[PDB]
Structure 1
Amino acid sequence: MVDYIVEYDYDAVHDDELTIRVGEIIRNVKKLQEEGWLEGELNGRRGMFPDNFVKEIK
């Protein structure tokens, strides 16, 4: 469930991270071993992104 919304942009540094822009919706967000990051789907891709750059949806 929990799809989140971007509030601050970010540019994927690491191969596995996403590039996100404010206002966008990330789907199927899942928590990971790593602290402070979340896994999601965007523009047909899954990647990690900072849990402190968005907000849950509900």
Structure 2
Amino acid sequence: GSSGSSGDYCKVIFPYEAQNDDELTIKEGDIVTLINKDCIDVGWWEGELNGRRGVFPDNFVKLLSGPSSG
């Protein structure tokens, strides 16, 4: 089956508005590929969306365990 996971997919449920370039703009109903994790401190994370690279509030998003149906 599966050997290992390359990245981490996260489903966006809460709409956010990036204030600065650093911050990424995400809407409700979109998945963002987690690029790099945040420091021991939770609440921040970096992902790629629409060919962009910026930070975002983890709380706003969530970690997907795995696709069951489709």
Q: TM-score range by the shorter chain?
A: 0.7 to 0.9
Structure 2 gap segments, 5+ residues each: 1-6, 66-70
Structure 1 gap segments, 5+ residues each: none
CA–CA distance in structure 2, aligned partners of residues 20 and 14 of structure 1: 13
| Structure number with higher helix proportion | 2
Larger radius of gyration: 2
CA-to-partner distance for each residue in 1:5-49, whole Å, 9 max, x for gaps? Answer: 111101001220101001101013421237311000000011100
* Runs of 4+ with deviation above 6 angstroms: none
Q: How many residues align?
A: 58
**Higher RCO, 1 or 2 (CA under 8 Å, sep at least 6)?**
1
What TM-score does the superposition give when structure 1 sets the normalisation length? Answer: 0.85
CA RMSD of aligned residues (A): 1.6
What TM-score does the superposition give when structure 2 sets the normalisation length? Answer: 0.72
Sequence identity of aligned pairs in percent? 52
